Design a protein around this ligand. Structure first.
Ligand SMILES: O=C(O)COc1cccc(CN(Cc2ccc(-n3cccn3)cc2)S(=O)(=O)c2cccnc2)c1
Lengths: 265, 228, 58, 340, 128
């Protein structure tokens, strides 16, 4: 049990987020991507030290080394950052869909000033829906790797509601992205750069549907089935990989950079 | 002492409360610059759709204000800079009456390549198609008498014409459209697009054309925000 | 060219009316400008920055 | 037919005579007797204030004679009167036409003028009897767009128009008292002298003219530039003035020498000048440009000694305060800045 | 002063050849794009030909394309228009116009009947 996979992907993720923040911290979309990379970096830097702590403070002997309320906070912040990133992605997809799908309506009703308020309402909803179990409405348990905790399968009805909320957000993001792709194809047919945007959105949608559905796929099964095949770990690793991929393809692979990479060839 | 300053602050607060209501109205309207070539039927097109005249119309609950300069001189390199933030310049060209077609081409070339109008888009209305058809069938005046490259010009493949017109009228119309699209296509210096259309006096669906072209303009405007 | 003859007469009239004027030498005019710029050299808050105590835009 | 060529030959003979007279009166260059005075060093102006509230590009701006209040005209249709010390908006007047191109503040602080593509100059009263700000007058009678206007007092106003003529109006009556003709292009700017006797006007014919207000005739013509003239401003003492044009060059002309004295240009400057102004002493010459910046020139040494770079779009207007304490600049990015 | 003086006009039998010249003074000739325009008896000003700052970009109108050829010599600040195979419909007053601003690629008002950067024009008459 060595950090051959965990620490390396954590380092890659924080390095990509810092690279993105370098070219970013110097429009509404601009406000949204700042907040997205901010919450991504916050979540990863506040979670990963806790999962690294159970590598030197225990030789696969005692999963709860620091205290009795450690992995509880781990699972809480895990669900919190997951819902936060998913709601941020939903907000960005809805903004883009409105921007390309309904231009006139977007031209008036939507302004950059109201963009800072998105983080405050999403954090509020996520704190509510993730401290919900802390008020005895749910309960956390530890898993086969031992270095993390999450919601228990059965004995309550919280994991199914969490998974269905995640699935609703995912299908909404996918619907918005497919509608924007359809509109871009339509505007390319009616007529360079629309092909660039099509390629970017295809990449983003594929990496979002690959790295975020397995959680819902595995959360609707028995706990005995997953641990036998060790799927519960990959279910969350894929969400973390999605949180890594988001800022990279949002800020570093912008249409200018894709145009440069295509001109080089 | 401080009462005067707080009265000033209250006056400023009321001024800003009014400026917000004015800002919400300034963003809902779309300004267009109707800049015809003269003797081109732009008066009939504003019939359809003293220093400057203004016409308001509404399509799908979207408001458009179209401005036509009136009592100005024929030198226009100084007052045209006022219209660099307008969403579209509607350029009307008398396709049949002309050398006014070369004058229109030179005016479009000056607008397209201007330093301040380099990110403004042009909706090109080639008016007077009925007279053009009747003059191409009647053979009274040829474009080869003013555009020697009209011969050897083959009509392109796409854009099937309506059945009632002679194919030579199609050739003339598309030759003029290509004369404008060569200028539109070639410079590449600034961002903006041209939308050529065929109109007439009997036509009645020009407001929806302007609506769709401005929708496309605003879509491409929003699209740029994502890159860089 | 019946509208041009009157315009040309007006132009030549203005030319010969503005040709008979007084002209001092460039040396004295430049000296007057230099003397004016030297007399008010201390009365220019932009030419010499005023401290933050008398600057109302501080 | 032939008499027209006779008149043209007479005109060219007079032009040659005037040019030879000018060359006779030119004995020593300004850049020669100024080679000893010490340079101003370097000017470092910083953005003290930034006034926000305009929706579109700002074309005009004008300080008040109390050196505190400011006016600005935007192409959204707003005439905003700011207090610059506290950054508070004192007034916000909505205009009938959105295409305003000029604005002026009366030397008494009671009226404000504005005009534009509607060929009309509207005068607004700022001190009505416990009421709103309303159109006091509407001076009509010009044929082209109104490009500049300046108050002589609360009753007289001089306006430049795009129909190649200037006009002096009596506001009370409402009709033109005097008309100044002679330009062959759009008159772009005008500048009042320290005294209210004379004023200079620049046009698109690459020439400037000096007009007497009381008589109504043109005194002198200056033809140093080679493109359209956009800006004009009097030297603080009224014996000289400075112009800027599209040929990317500012120039200094003298009234009594009747010729140009200095040329402010640089190799990497290939954009036109939109506005020029003089400081209180007359030693510095500020000029706004199309490349989004403002340059400060040593009016006597002709070397540039400072830059003003805070605007994101073309600098449209620029004005130094009557006490010489601040420089307001307005740009097409819809922001007014104060530099000190 | 910006001065443009044209020369070379005259009466020529149909089919002959002419060469109009345009001497410029008061501006940097090599920074402006130059134009030849003309006015026919009883008509308005129309654009004939134009050439850019260097001489690489050249354009003619449909009526003269193939017959006329425009050139500029920057060494002596001169513009030339060589007219070949003239016809009776070429009789007009020819003007040498300068583009209003330097370094630009667009010239707005060269045919405005009041343009200030034009010349006085030479009468080119084609008859027998
Ligand atoms: O010991 C072992 O093998 C088991 O360790 C485990 C067990 C379960 C799940 C994980 C994944 N991680 C936890 C995590 C999840 C989501 C976010 N986040 C989401 C949005 C914003 N932030 C941040 C951190 S992670 O490895 O630390 C990581 C991966 C990639 C990038 N940053 C950190 C690891």
């Amino acid at each position: 049990e060595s950090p051959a996979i965990s620490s390396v992907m954590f380092s890659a993720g924080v390095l990509g987020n810092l690279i993105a923040l370098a070219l970013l911290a110097r429009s509404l979309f601009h406000v949204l991507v700042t907040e997205l990379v901010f919450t991504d970096l916050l979540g990863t830097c506040l979670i990963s030290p806790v999962v690294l702590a159970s590598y030197a403070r225990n030789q696969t002997l005692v999963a709860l080394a620091p205290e009795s309320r450690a992995c509880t906070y781990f699972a809480f912040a895990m669900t919190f950052f997951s819902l936060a990133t998913m709601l941020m992605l939903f907000a960005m997809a809805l903004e883009r869909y409105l921007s390309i799908g309904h231009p006139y309506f977007y031209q008036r009703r939507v302004s950059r000033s109201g963009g800072l308020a998105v983080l405050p309402v999403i954090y509020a909803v996520s704190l509510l829906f993730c401290s919900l179990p802390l008020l005895d409405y749910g309960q956390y348990v530890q898993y086969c790797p031992g270095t993390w905790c999450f919601i228990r399968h059965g004995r309550t009805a919280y994991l199914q509601l969490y998974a269905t909320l995640l699935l609703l957000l995912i299908v909404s993001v996918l619907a918005c992205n497919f509608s924007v792709i359809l509109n871009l194809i339509r505007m390319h047919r009616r007529s360079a750069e629309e092909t660039d945007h099509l390629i970017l959105l295809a990449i983003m949608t594929i990496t979002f549907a690959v790295c975020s559905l397995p959680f819902t796929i595995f959360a609707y099964m028995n706990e005995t089935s997953s641990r036998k095949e060790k799927w519960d770990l990959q279910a969350l690793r894929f969400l973390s990989i999605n949180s890594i991929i988001d800022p990279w393809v949002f800020a570093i692979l912008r249409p200018p950079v894709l145009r440069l990479m295509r001109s080089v060839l | 002492q401080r009462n005067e300053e707080k009265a000033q602050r209250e006056a400023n607060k009321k001024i800003e409360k009014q400026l917000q209501k004015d800002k919400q109205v300034y963003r809902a309207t779309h300004r267009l610059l109707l800049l015809g070539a003269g003797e081109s039927g732009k008066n009939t097109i504003v019939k359809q759709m003293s220093g400057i005249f203004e016409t308001k119309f509404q399509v799908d609950k979207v408001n458009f204000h179209m401005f036509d300069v009136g009592a100005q001189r024929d030198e226009r390199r100084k007052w045209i800079q006022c219209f660099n933030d307008v969403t579209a310049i509607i350029f009307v060209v008398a396709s049949s009456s002309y050398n006014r077609l070369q004058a229109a081409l030179k005016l479009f070339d000056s607008i397209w390549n201007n330093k301040w109008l380099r990110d403004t888009s042009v909706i090109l209305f080639l008016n007077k198609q009925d007279l053009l058809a009747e003059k191409v069938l009647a053979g009274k005046s040829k474009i080869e008498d003013y555009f020697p490259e009209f011969a050897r010009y083959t009509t392109p493949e796409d854009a099937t014409p309506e059945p009632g017109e002679d194919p030579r009228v199609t050739r003339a119309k598309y030759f003029i459209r290509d004369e404008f699209l060569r200028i539109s296509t070639a410079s590449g210096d600034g961002r903006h697009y041209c939308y050529p259309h065929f109109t007439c006096a009997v036509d009645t669906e020009n407001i929806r054309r302007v609506f769709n072209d401005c929708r496309d303009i605003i879509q491409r405007m929003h699209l740029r925000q994502y890159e860089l | 060219n019946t509208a041009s003859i009157a315009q040309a007469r007006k132009l030549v009239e203005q030319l010969k009316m503005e040709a008979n004027i007084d002209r001092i030498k460039v040396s004295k005019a430049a000296a007057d400008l230099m003397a004016y710029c030297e007399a008010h050299a201390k009365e220019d808050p932009l030419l010499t920055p005023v401290p933050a105590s008398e600057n109302p835009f501080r | 037919q032939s008499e027209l060529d006779q008149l043209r030959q007479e005109a060219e003979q007079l032009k040659n005579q005037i040019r030879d007279a000018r060359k006779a009166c030119a004995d020593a260059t300004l850049s020669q007797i100024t080679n000893n005075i010490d340079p101003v060093g370097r000017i470092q102006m910083r953005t003290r204030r930034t006034l926000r509230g305009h929706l579109a590009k700002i074309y005009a701006m004008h300080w008040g004679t109390d050196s505190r209040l400011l006016v600005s005209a935007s192409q959204d249709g707003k005439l905003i009167i700011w207090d610059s010390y506290t950054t508070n908006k004192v007034h916000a007047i909505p205009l009938r036409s959105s295409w305003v191109m000029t604005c002026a503040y009366a030397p008494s602080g009671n009226y404000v003028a504005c005009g534009g593509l509607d060929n009309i100059c509207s005068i607004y009263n700022l001190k009505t009897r416990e009421g709103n700000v309303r159109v006091s007058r509407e001076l009509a009678g010009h044929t082209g767009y109104l490009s500049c206007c300046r108050f002589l007092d609360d009753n007289q106003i001089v306006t430049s128009s795009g129909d190649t003529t200037c006009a002096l109006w009596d506001i009370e009556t409402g009709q033109q008292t005097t008309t100044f003709t002679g330009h062959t292009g759009d008159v772009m700017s005008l500048s009042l002298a320290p005294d209210t006797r004379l004023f200079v006007s620049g046009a698109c014919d690459a020439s400037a003219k000096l007009w007497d207000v009381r008589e109504g005739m043109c005194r002198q013509t200056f033809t140093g530039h080679e493109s359209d003239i956009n800006a004009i401003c009097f030297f603080p003492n009224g014996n000289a003035f400075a112009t800027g044009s599209d040929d990317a060059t500012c120039r200094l002309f003298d009234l009594r020498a009747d010729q140009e004295l200095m040329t402010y240009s640089h190799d990497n400057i290939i954009c036109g000048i939109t506005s020029v102004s003089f400081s209180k002493s007359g030693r510095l010459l500020l000029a706004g440009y199309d490349d989004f910046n403002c340059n400060v020139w040593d009016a006597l040494k002709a070397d540039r000694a400072g830059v003003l770079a805070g605007h994101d779009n073309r600098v449209s207007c620029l004005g130094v305060t009557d006490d010489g304490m601040a420089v307001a600049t307005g740009s097409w990015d819809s922001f007014l800045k104060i530099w000190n | 002063q910006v001065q443009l003086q044209e020369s070379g006009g005259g009466l020529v039998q149909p089919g002959g050849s002419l060469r109009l010249s345009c001497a410029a003074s008061g501006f940097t000739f090599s920074n402006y794009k130059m134009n030849w325009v003309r006015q026919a008896p009883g008509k308005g000003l129309e654009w004939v030909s134009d050439i850019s700052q260097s001489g690489a970009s050249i354009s003619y109108t449909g009526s003269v394309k193939g017959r006329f050829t425009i050139s500029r010599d920057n060494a002596k600040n001169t513009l030339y228009l060589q007219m070949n195979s003239l016809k009776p419909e070429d009789t007009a007053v020819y003007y040498c116009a300068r583009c209003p601003a330097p370094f630009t690629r667009d010239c707005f008002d060269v045919t405005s009947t009041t343009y200030a950067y034009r010349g006085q024009g030479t009468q080119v008459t084609v008859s027998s």
